[PDB]
Amino acid sequence: TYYPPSSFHFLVEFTGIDAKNNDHEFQSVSGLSVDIDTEEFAEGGENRFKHKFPVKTKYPNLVLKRGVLVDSKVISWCRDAIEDFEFKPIDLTVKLLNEEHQPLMTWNVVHAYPVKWSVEDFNAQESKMAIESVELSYNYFKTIV
Amino acid sequence: TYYPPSSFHFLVEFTGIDAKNNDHEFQSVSGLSVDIDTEEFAEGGENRFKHKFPVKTKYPNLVLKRGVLVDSKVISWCRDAIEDFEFKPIDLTVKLLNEEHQPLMTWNVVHAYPVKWSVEDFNAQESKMAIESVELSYNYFKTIV
Amino acid sequence: SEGKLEKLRIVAYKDSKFSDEVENGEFITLLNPEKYKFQYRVEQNEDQASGTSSAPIRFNKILPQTLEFDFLFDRTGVIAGYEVTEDGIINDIDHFKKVVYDYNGEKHKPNYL
Amino acid sequence: SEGKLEKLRIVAYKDSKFSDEVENGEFITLLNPEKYKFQYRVEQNEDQASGTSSAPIRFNKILPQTLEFDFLFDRTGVIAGYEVTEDGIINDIDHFKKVVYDYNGEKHKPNYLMITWGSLLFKGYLKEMDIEYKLFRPDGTPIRAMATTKIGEFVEEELRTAQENNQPDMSHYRTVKEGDTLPLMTYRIYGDSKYYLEVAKANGLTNFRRLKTGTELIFPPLQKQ
8 A cells, every 4th residue: 555554463264253352362363375387289380389278266374373272162162073983064254353442354265174184392491372273174265355 | 798688678569558666666577488389209210319390489577566456457358258148358569678768679579368366365463565476478579689 | 470389280180181261160279388399100010030130121111100299278368468268178179179179061081191 | 266176086887979968977086087098090092003103092981089188086085075985995986887887787788878077078988997006004995996998989870960061963043243154163063164055044044244233143953873
């Protein structure tokens, strides 16, 4: 913009999971990008370049981090998939906020489910917070702005 | 030259997309280079070297970076290709400028289209600007100088 | 016209002297093949008697030749010079098969190429 | 309805004209194949004598066509639009086999098949099938399987002669344009210039060495036995 916005003020909301204020707060969000797979072809007589063709649109997994929370609803949902193969996809909204705490821009993440859950190593000789990490697979996203 | 020019003053212009002043300003440009693929052959009796032959001219993708802009025309164009497989290639000009803000040298980029779009990770504990990145595929380029 | 990129063509014919063209029987490609390949074979007679150290190999005949190549059809919209069609590649493949494959009831055979 | 994702269908038929449907004999897939493939073969006769540099080539036959594709069955619960079933994929595979594989006692054979998806329309017979079972519930109910298929091509014999409109055996008519001669036109119709006096007698022509440029002529067929 004339002065572009910073990246440290944002909100993560879930649809299909009971809401709690402690499940909307995160330390970091990553994975909001996309790419197109292509193929190459050489045409006889054309020596200046090879041709390139698109094939598929590709998205990476969405990664969320925060300090450990013991009564999380999101984690209970993750456990049902992890332990029993019960899968029930959800939708999600990522919001980048302005100074009035209203959205500048949002991302609509469609049909997501859990593929990973972990907690970082313990160390008796270091002063650190216990950090939890969750990774989700989804089909695509759209933006609103 | 006697005193070679610096690299921090330049302009990116698009043909086929409605113009806005905010879409001509970028933080960084990269990918303006080329190479030739070759093959090798060993001739019996010649023990001093192998022969090498050219096959094809090759170009890398063009990469543009800037702070996040919410109403960009270039991004709307990228979305049509990304979301619906509607492809409509454009031409582009890269200009390296002098002190009168006129071109020292330009690059003519031919038949380009979008293959990638991303925004860097958010971090609640760091003071940073949100940065956007766009990558384009093209056939070749020519220079004027 | 050195600078013109020539495109490969295939024409169908009615007679064995190649002078009478099939009507609407010409195919022009939109992308050239990368390469093509030929094959040549000569056959000899190699019978010999036992107890001997070599045979004087004899000429038999020269076998027919062979050509091979590959094609690509694409109407996605990233190749300069062409337009996107409402029905894609449906009419390109149907015209290609009518020239090189289909049986002709006037001559009781497929076409000369 | 451009925006609709069409799904591949297979219907079973009772007769060789494809007009009498088998009751409850239609299969619709839930996931489309990635690709499909065709095969075409033409056979020639290539006998030649010794001492020669080339053979005299003669057309022999056009061989039947072939179609191949692969399928995936899955009822795990991550694909949008579908529900998880109590018995998984058991009824999906049993209905697929009843259409394409099973023997029909009314006709003493398996079924005629029509395969349609978008631009594709193919009639024929199943030749080969392989089914591999991949995931299971703890009580042994399958929830994922993969199938490979090969289809042959069927043409009824009355339709083959109508598509091969085989024509010195039939009758013909032309109109005379300026530049035409009678022995050149006879060569292009019969293969020989020597029949020009029989064409002129069948049309009542006396001055056949000059044709007038609006005349319609007949060309009778050659006699047999």
